[PDB]
Amino acid sequence: RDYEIQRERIELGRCIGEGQFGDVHQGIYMSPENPAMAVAIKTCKNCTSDSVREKFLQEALTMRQFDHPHIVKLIGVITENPVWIIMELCTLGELRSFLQVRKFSLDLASLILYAYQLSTALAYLESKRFVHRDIAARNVLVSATDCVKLGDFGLSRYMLPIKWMAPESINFRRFTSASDVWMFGVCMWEILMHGVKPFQGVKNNDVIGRIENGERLPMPPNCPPTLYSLMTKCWAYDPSRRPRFTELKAQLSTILEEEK
Ligand SMILES: CNC(=O)c1ccccc1Nc1ncnc(Nc2ccc(N3CCOCC3)cc2OC)n1
Numbered sequence: 001r002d003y004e005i006q007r008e009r010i011e012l013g014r015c016i017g018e019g020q021f022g023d024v025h026q027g028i029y030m031s032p033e034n035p036a037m038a039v040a041i042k043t044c045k046n047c048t049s050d051s052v053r054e055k056f057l058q059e060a061l062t063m064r065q066f067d068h069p070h071i072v073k074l075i076g077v078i079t080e081n082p083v084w085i086i087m088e089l090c091t092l093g094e095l096r097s098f099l100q101v102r103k104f105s106l107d108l109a110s111l112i113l114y115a116y117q118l119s120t121a122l123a124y125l126e127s128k129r130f131v132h133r134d135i136a137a138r139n140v141l142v143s144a145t146d147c148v149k150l151g152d153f154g155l156s157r158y159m160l161p162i163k164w165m166a167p168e169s170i171n172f173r174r175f176t177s178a179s180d181v182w183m184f185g186v187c188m189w190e191i192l193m194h195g196v197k198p199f200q201g202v203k204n205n206d207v208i209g210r211i212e213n214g215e216r217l218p219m220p221p222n223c224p225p226t227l228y229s230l231m232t233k234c235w236a237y238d239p240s241r242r243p244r245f246t247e248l249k250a251q252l253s254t255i256l257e258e259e260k
Contacts, residue, residue, distance in 0.1 A: 003060075003064070003074070003076045003077050004076060004077060004078070004079060005029070005075070005076035005077065005078055005086055006078075007078055007080070009029055009030050009031060010027055010028070010029060010030075010039070010041065010078070010084070010086065011027050011028045011030065012025050012027045012041060013025055013026045013027040013028065014026055016040070016093075017155070019042065019152075019154060019155040019157075020154070020157070020158075021042065021043070021044040021045075021047075021052070021055075021056045021059075021154075022042070022043040022044050022045040023042075023043045023045070024040060024041065024042050024043070024155065025040070025041040025043065026038065026039070026040060026041070026089055027039055027040075027041050029075060029086065037075075038089040038091060039075055039086050039087060039088065039089050040072070040086075040087040040088065040089045040090075040152075041084050041085070041086055041087070042056075042059070042084060042085040042087065042152070042154070042155070043082060043083075043084055044056045044082060044083045044084070045082070047081060047082055047083040048081055048083070053083055056083060056085070057077065057079065057083065057085070059085060059152070059153070059154030060074055060077050060085045062153050062154065063087070063152060063153060063154075065128075066124070066125075066128070066130075068120075068121050068124045069117075069120075069149075070117045070118060070120055070121035070124075070147075070148065070149050070150065071121050071124070071125075071149055071150045072087050072088045072090065072141065072149050072150065072151050072152060073087065073088040074086070074087060074088075075087060075088060087152060088149075090141035090142055090143040090149055090151070091143070091144075092141075092142035092143065092144065092145070093141065093142060094138070094140075094141060094142070095114070095137050095138075095140040095141065095142055095148060095191070095195065096137050096138060096190070096195035097195070098142045098195075099111075099137075099191065099194040099195035100194060100195045102145075103194045106194075108222060108224075108259055109256070109259050109260050110145070110146070111191050111192055111194075112227065112252065112255060112256045112259055113146060113256060114140070114148045114191055115187075115188045115191055115252055116249070116252040116253060116256050117147065117148050117149075118140065118148060118150065118184070118187070119184070119245060119248045119249045119252050120249055121149070121150050122135070122150075122180065122184060122245040122248075122249075123245040123246050123248070123249045125180075125245075126177045126180070126244065126245045126246070127246075131175050131176060131177060131179075131180060132150075132153065132156070132180055132183075133169075133175045133179070133180070133183075134153075134156040134157055134158075134161065134164075134183075135150075135164070135180055135183035135184050135186075135187050136156075136161060136164050136183060136186065136187055136190070137187050137190035137191060137195060139151050139155075139156040140187070160204075161183075162204040162207050162208065163186070163197070163198045163199045163202075163204065163207055164182075164183045164186045164187075164198065165179070165182070165183065166178065166179035166181075166182035166183065166239065167182075167208070167211055167212065167237060168239055169182070170208055171208075174239075176239065177244065177245065178239035178240065178242050179239065180245070181234050181242045181243065181244070181245065181248070182234055182235060182239075182242065184234060184245070184248070185231045185232075185233075185234025185235050186198055186217070186234075186235075188227075188231055188234075189217045189220065189231060192220035192222075192223045192227075193220050198217055199217075211237075212237075214237075216232060216235050217231075217235075224255065224258075224259065226255055226258075227255055230243075230248070230251055230252070230255070234248075
């Protein structure tokens with residue numbers, strides 16, 4: 001694989017957001033005798049700035065090492081100014097908006113499907129000793145009505161997301177697979193709530209107080225008990241009492257099959 005892509009193969013479409021380094025666009029990758037392929041394009045305004053270009057392109061390098069159906073893929077890079085990273089596009093956009101609009105048209109089976117797919121991605125990351133640290137519905141994208149994906153790891157960063165974070169992450173800056181399991185538990189809660197944020201109206205400071213007192217997000221309406229049980233397990237104060245993503249995958253499979 002040569003990841004460098006000729007600039008003329010890319011047509012820049014609309015801005016669909018932004019990150020630390022600049023704007024994110026949707027567009028198209030064109031190639032001889034092929035259908036145009038829809039893509040996301042990260043831009044770096046004032047790249048080179050040589051140190052800036054380095055950390056920008058490191059975002060591509062992070063994505064490059066991963067190969068999973070439920071994690072967005074790197075297509076390629078343009079390493080001349082202005083520097084761009086070319087990623088797979090998920091055409092239906094962000095999960096939260098998707099869940100809010102399609103609420104009365106989504107069944108419970110689909111919502112569990114999304115948590116299952118994601119857990120397979122996270123079982124994949126854990127087996128590569130990779131720690132995401134920003135698992136949250138805000139960072140999941142919708143590829144098809146029956147397909148969600150973790151988005152770019154670079155664009156996922158920043159909020160300290162106190163409301164999603166494991167206690168040992170907040171208190172002592174420890175970030176492991178176990179703290180990832182905490183955040184996933186929150187992410188499934190968001191999914192079952194159809195994109196409502198955790199701890200609405202609660203100040204960040206109040207949030208750590210509440211979790212130490214043993215308070216947890218409530219069971220969503222129409223969440224099956226076994227699923228909420230699995231969730232609360234993700235929120236064991238003791239990091240080693242939480243299931244691994246391997247276990248989460250296995251249990252969600254059977255819960256999903258049950259609901260179908
Ligand atoms: C973790 N977040 C990211 O990776 C990300 C954040 C903001 C913008 C794009 C991101 N990355 C990304 N990748 C692959 N596909 C997509 N698709 C996508 C995302 C947001 C939108 N929006 C369109 C309307 O405004 C709100 C967001 C549209 C998209 O495809 C049309 N996005």
